[PDB]
Amino acid sequence: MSISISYSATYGGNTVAQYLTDWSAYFGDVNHRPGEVVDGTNTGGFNPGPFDGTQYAIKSTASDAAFVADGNLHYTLFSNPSHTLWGSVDTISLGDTLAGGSGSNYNLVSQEVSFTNLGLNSLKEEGRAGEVHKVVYGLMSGDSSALAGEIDALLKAIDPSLSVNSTFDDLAAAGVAHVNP
């Protein structure tokens, strides 16, 4: 299935690339790094978890920004290859004001953009070189490059004219993106 994008009308005139840069600047970096994960404040969480589920979500420690990844996800924690997120991601949703987690599915109250039918898939054995790992860990760490590259490849696979340098409105014109009510 080809990529499909939903977006808040607010961002219609933004390029996908520019939106991702800005969102990442707003989320910042949760400092999910050696020596810097010392409590539960920058781990994020799995649904149902603790180390697997159909969602991973994390809140910014710098702002209200948050994201949710939907799919079939597994985190190795200390087990070799350590600190690898692997499995499949179908959807990534970016925005503000995370809700749920506790019997409810994670969801953003302000879902700004959502990218679905991503068909990302990574095996455990790929370790931290897996596309799933790099995409999500990038977002955690203030670098939306990996996500941008993946969306870019999925748009181009539809047609070489479509890319992250298109606006959301451009992609809606091309039938690939859709404004949220």
Ligand code: HEM
């Ligand atoms: C429940 C969720 C998670 C928990 C409890 C968790 C726990 C940890 C802890 C405790 C560390 C630090 C280890 C140390 O300082 O010795 C760590 C590091 C790390 N975690 Fe996570 N983590 C979670 C989710 C994620 C996710 C979703 C990713 C990737 C998308 C990830 C990637 C990493 C990476 C790359 C490191 C750095 C390891 C290194 O450079 O050696 N973690 N994690």
